[PDB]
């Protein structure tokens, strides 16, 4: 199957076959950043697009231009490990070829005088590591993807939340990628209002007159003309029949025959249809009918010439009589009715004050720049630069796509800027929606929300830096220094460096990497955030953005979200969800062509997904592919219903398509309530890696994917044979099948040993392979933290009993056996870094030294002659790690201590002890010491011995890899020499190196031999210069901060054993705190004397309906019951026939399960290795929603000779008598969370105080006080505790004189306070007087 | 009139500053002659 997976095969209970493999889980980060930094031959993505966005830069002249040729990312100075050690960003220099092209003064062509083309250095770009992280100032960071509103036009409303009448008021919003917002909206009186950048609203026809439309052109845009072609008399009128739909009958219609409908009867469809049966075109209308209609044109006379009636005036008998003396043939009129064609545009032309383009531009100017007198040129340029300038407005390719798609346009390409047509179409569609011919958008739809990832946010910030340098380059080109300067004199790299440095280090989406376990890391990298620059604020994010929308299905997990103030604002990508080329989340679906469900997979976005009927993955289907049922459950439109088997278009590709990677790891998630499943998904990624990793007995099968797709393991790049395995390195001799020609064919994997994560946990890699073992490509070679043989192992398998035990598991407490502590099951290694910084002070430099005043020889016992602790020293709280003294002066002795030193003659110290000590309560081992010394400071003996050790280690590592690689080359040479022209015993007669001097008969043989010789010479001279690069980077000085002379970083390794107060949890939201650690003879025990490891309360189960923790227990007892059997067969030393038979029974169990494990294919050695890996319980995979059924759990309990009830008879360890009912005993996967009570417990009697107010400081890092806030003060006021309160306010926090008096009174045994005024009240009085206000205490 | 419409002292300054027109090469000369 593999070599790494048939070591220990997890028994799969899933029944649906897997059509699509779970993708690479970190594709989001890696694909986004690859689009950022790769060389795009077109200008679509990344740095190329950003450079072409601003270049060519042309000055306010025709003389010169700066144009862009190419870019290039140089090699990083330090690699990622050196960057983490030295505290510097892992980045690559950006070298850009620019061309300063100079045009001469006077030509119709403006041809070139010369071009000065050279490479400028603009900034360093932080490089993403192999696993999707950035090392920024030494720490690994993750740039979280952003769910933001897509650019485009969005039609919305308020539903009766205005005007107190329940009237729904619609609006349209054009949101660009970059530029000003453009809102149209309706007022409660149905007038259209434009509003730019959320400012005061103008009537929407003002923006129509800023465009060159007259009122006549506006009226023909937004209306259709009722024509009165009036003959000599009788008022003839044009009519199309659907214009009298629902018309109020102002007159009886007689034409082409007599009356159809008399007065007092409104027009229904039969009347329109019989009138068009009569094919009526011309109708005689009364005079009172046209009185009130609105003329659509400017009608002027030819007698005098001036205006008879203007456009958009309500026509009357008087004005029609006026034009009748002028004899007009046709008079147009706006067709308006109620509820099908509204008057809103005319009723808006009546409210605006503007009458031409200049007045509209001026009103827009007064709105945008108030208090600034508008000139015609500024009023014209403000509008033209608002939305119609490429440099100020970008409705991007996604914004143009969503814009055209929202207005039902065919093309999805366009300009980034608005046009007259775009704005008119938006107004027309808002009017349609007002007139009932459309519906408002759902803005929480995931067709309306878009993913913006690190490679796009980084590009945006780079373009920001590029325009910041573009203004200065355009300013420099306007100067007459133009013939002697190169392009690297006008390019300033510091603004461009600052933009990307600010993004990568200071963004809200640039987050300290969650590095508790592998699941923490890949959950952080697959995180989507609505927050961030350009997103929401968590304080003003309402209830509806924090909701599970129907479009989240398959794209965003509905379960994995944090529980606090930002819930539904931080989301997690689903397992199969990927991002469109436009940034929209899509999810894969199987195509259902003829009722046959095909293996053809289409990725559908949330807009496309709603068009189709999509069957569930719980839908059964026969061998040929057809549904075995004929009425399938599907989602058609965001609803879900039953459909016929011929209506379905797609099917879900998996049952875990809907959940994230974290929720995919909870077995029996379908039996857990969704709140508790949310808690379990959130707590799985707080688990701390224990000493030994323990696979889950009950997993889901996503464990291998999680452990491999994070970079915590060492995975075989090419297959081979383990040539040398060792706790710190694996050396693979690659198979000849996978070797390139001219290559040693040796893969070397250097394992990470005991380094600290971002969370101060331990990152340690241990090899899985043994010596000489065959590996295939993609096999796990070394386990990371919290992985066991390449499976993600976050916790330990604990034998739990669900029963109340004497109140010790009351209210989520957990009772733990003492055997759990003896066996070090939840012991975790934590690594602290502690820095001692020696600086220049004004009194002189601080000095790292072992000669410390007021410190005995006992406290300097584990310091070397340089004053630094030895490596390996077992230290505890208060022990000096680095001895340091600060020079001081002017001790200003009190007369009493002056006499004290006169009597005993003891000099005062000119230095004060400023040493680095172990924090109190922390007791660890010094495992590493790093000394960073400034240039010009002399290295002490410790820095020199550390650097000598580093140089020997660099030379040793390089000579070791050269020995390995040249051994590989010479094995290949010996193999190619006996492959033709055999020297099989002559080769061992020749000296080793001069096999390279053997001219061979070349069919192809001497070609390979000579490229192998060339490869060997290049390996030797590559080692030779990597040695000098290492040596120069070791002996060089450190770029420390200004003022810092040296830094000594000590690394403590602390083994933390589990103790009462440590938070423990299951994967089903069953958290709890250890209350007691019980002796083994006190724990409940079964008939065989086996005690229970952990006793959990059964009362936490039925109200918090996480039933999956019971099933996981029942299955965990079954799984272990298999191992308990296999173990027995391995202790009785049974034959391999019996072990093979029983393990085949155990793997064949299940109701039509999808996996087939045939052990007849296995050799006896492979069966025995499997049986040895299954003797601690057979691991079991229970896919989410596709898991084990309870009947299969009972069948497997029956196979292990256990009660299928899951409940056994337990005895009290203390009395020996039965508990009166059977108890659910089994195995649950427990996790130790990073809420350790060592980090939480803090106390303080007195300490440091703040400067301005003199109250205690904040945290336990500052040794601070507890906040006795306002509600605690109310609690004390509700009691009559006036003295307790008065000492909280005055004498414990702020009364400066009273608190030292209180200390002295406590020391004298006198528990009395002399309370004064709080110092913050004096601060308050002085701050109210710094206003113009005389606040004063009336001291009478 | 833009009086009473803005709070910005920069806009107020630019507004009252732009009410004086630039001088020619000849305007500077006879202002300097007046001085
Ligand atoms: C080439 C590609 C389609 C093929 C088009 C379609 C959508 C376009 C992106 C979006 O517009 C968002 C963003 C706008 C910025 O302005 C420039 C970067 C971004 C990432 C665009 C890049 C590029 O233009 C995209 C990918
Ligand atoms: C088995 C294998 C091929 C035969 C031989 C040839 C090259 C040998 C390694 C190198 O010498 C470097 C290093 C020397 C240390 O001393 C011991 C460990 C190392 C890794 C060696 C192990 C082993 O001996 C190797 C892999």
PDB file of C-alpha atoms and ligand atoms in Angstrom, chain A residues 35 40 42-46 49-50 148 151 177-178 394-401 413 450-452 455-457 459-460 463 580-583, ligand 1:
ATOM      1  CA  UNK A  35       1.183  34.705  -8.275  1.00  0.00           C
ATOM      2  CA  UNK A  40       4.289  37.088 -15.283  1.00  0.00           C
ATOM      3  CA  UNK A  42       1.642  39.385 -19.212  1.00  0.00           C
ATOM      4  CA  UNK A  43       0.941  42.177 -16.785  1.00  0.00           C
ATOM      5  CA  UNK A  44      -1.887  40.533 -14.908  1.00  0.00           C
ATOM      6  CA  UNK A  45      -0.457  39.351 -11.588  1.00  0.00           C
ATOM      7  CA  UNK A  46       1.910  40.469  -8.930  1.00  0.00           C
ATOM      8  CA  UNK A  49       1.248  44.330 -12.713  1.00  0.00           C
ATOM      9  CA  UNK A  50       2.332  46.742  -9.993  1.00  0.00           C
ATOM     10  CA  UNK A 148     -14.217  41.380   1.838  1.00  0.00           C
ATOM     11  CA  UNK A 151     -16.157  45.423  -6.076  1.00  0.00           C
ATOM     12  CA  UNK A 177     -11.499  48.323  -5.896  1.00  0.00           C
ATOM     13  CA  UNK A 178      -9.885  51.719  -5.412  1.00  0.00           C
ATOM     14  CA  UNK A 394     -10.245  51.432 -10.330  1.00  0.00           C
ATOM     15  CA  UNK A 395     -13.326  49.284 -10.691  1.00  0.00           C
ATOM     16  CA  UNK A 396     -11.027  46.322 -11.113  1.00  0.00           C
ATOM     17  CA  UNK A 397     -11.337  43.269 -13.344  1.00  0.00           C
ATOM     18  CA  UNK A 398     -13.405  41.578 -10.640  1.00  0.00           C
ATOM     19  CA  UNK A 399     -15.309  44.815 -10.144  1.00  0.00           C
ATOM     20  CA  UNK A 400     -15.951  45.183 -13.857  1.00  0.00           C
ATOM     21  CA  UNK A 401     -17.004  41.528 -14.022  1.00  0.00           C
ATOM     22  CA  UNK A 413     -14.259  42.836 -19.622  1.00  0.00           C
ATOM     23  CA  UNK A 450     -14.427  37.769  -2.239  1.00  0.00           C
ATOM     24  CA  UNK A 451     -11.152  36.299  -0.980  1.00  0.00           C
ATOM     25  CA  UNK A 452      -8.102  38.543  -0.963  1.00  0.00           C
ATOM     26  CA  UNK A 455      -0.178  37.719  -2.778  1.00  0.00           C
ATOM     27  CA  UNK A 456      -2.814  40.342  -3.561  1.00  0.00           C
ATOM     28  CA  UNK A 457      -2.587  42.389  -0.374  1.00  0.00           C
ATOM     29  CA  UNK A 459       0.807  43.620  -4.332  1.00  0.00           C
ATOM     30  CA  UNK A 460      -1.546  46.395  -3.245  1.00  0.00           C
ATOM     31  CA  UNK A 463       1.732  49.565  -5.505  1.00  0.00           C
ATOM     32  CA  UNK A 580     -11.696  31.346  -8.306  1.00  0.00           C
ATOM     33  CA  UNK A 581      -9.478  33.295 -10.662  1.00  0.00           C
ATOM     34  CA  UNK A 582     -11.577  36.256  -9.495  1.00  0.00           C
ATOM     35  CA  UNK A 583     -11.261  35.440  -5.811  1.00  0.00           C
TER      36      UNK A 583
HETATM   37  C1  LIG C   1      -6.085  38.384 -15.093  1.00  0.00           C
HETATM   38  C2  LIG C   1      -7.232  37.960 -14.184  1.00  0.00           C
HETATM   39  C3  LIG C   1      -8.305  37.276 -15.009  1.00  0.00           C
HETATM   40  C4  LIG C   1      -7.642  36.328 -15.993  1.00  0.00           C
HETATM   41  C5  LIG C   1      -7.842  39.159 -13.453  1.00  0.00           C
HETATM   42  C6  LIG C   1      -9.310  38.896 -13.039  1.00  0.00           C
HETATM   43  C7  LIG C   1      -9.475  39.406 -11.602  1.00  0.00           C
HETATM   44  C8  LIG C   1      -8.243  40.282 -11.406  1.00  0.00           C
HETATM   45  C9  LIG C   1      -7.841  40.618  -9.983  1.00  0.00           C
HETATM   46  C10 LIG C   1      -8.969  41.374  -9.264  1.00  0.00           C
HETATM   47  O1  LIG C   1      -9.392  42.407 -10.099  1.00  0.00           O
HETATM   48  C11 LIG C   1      -8.489  41.832  -7.873  1.00  0.00           C
HETATM   49  C12 LIG C   1      -7.143  42.560  -7.888  1.00  0.00           C
HETATM   50  C13 LIG C   1      -7.285  43.948  -8.511  1.00  0.00           C
HETATM   51  C14 LIG C   1      -5.959  44.700  -8.476  1.00  0.00           C
HETATM   52  O2  LIG C   1      -6.220  45.926  -9.097  1.00  0.00           O
HETATM   53  C15 LIG C   1      -4.932  43.895  -9.280  1.00  0.00           C
HETATM   54  C16 LIG C   1      -4.753  42.529  -8.636  1.00  0.00           C
HETATM   55  C17 LIG C   1      -6.065  41.732  -8.609  1.00  0.00           C
HETATM   56  C18 LIG C   1      -5.809  40.427  -7.853  1.00  0.00           C
HETATM   57  C19 LIG C   1      -6.541  41.431 -10.038  1.00  0.00           C
HETATM   58  C20 LIG C   1      -5.437  40.702 -10.804  1.00  0.00           C
HETATM   59  C21 LIG C   1      -5.874  40.350 -12.228  1.00  0.00           C
HETATM   60  O3  LIG C   1      -6.166  41.491 -12.982  1.00  0.00           O
HETATM   61  C22 LIG C   1      -7.144  39.483 -12.127  1.00  0.00           C
HETATM   62  C23 LIG C   1      -6.819  38.189 -11.369  1.00  0.00           C
END
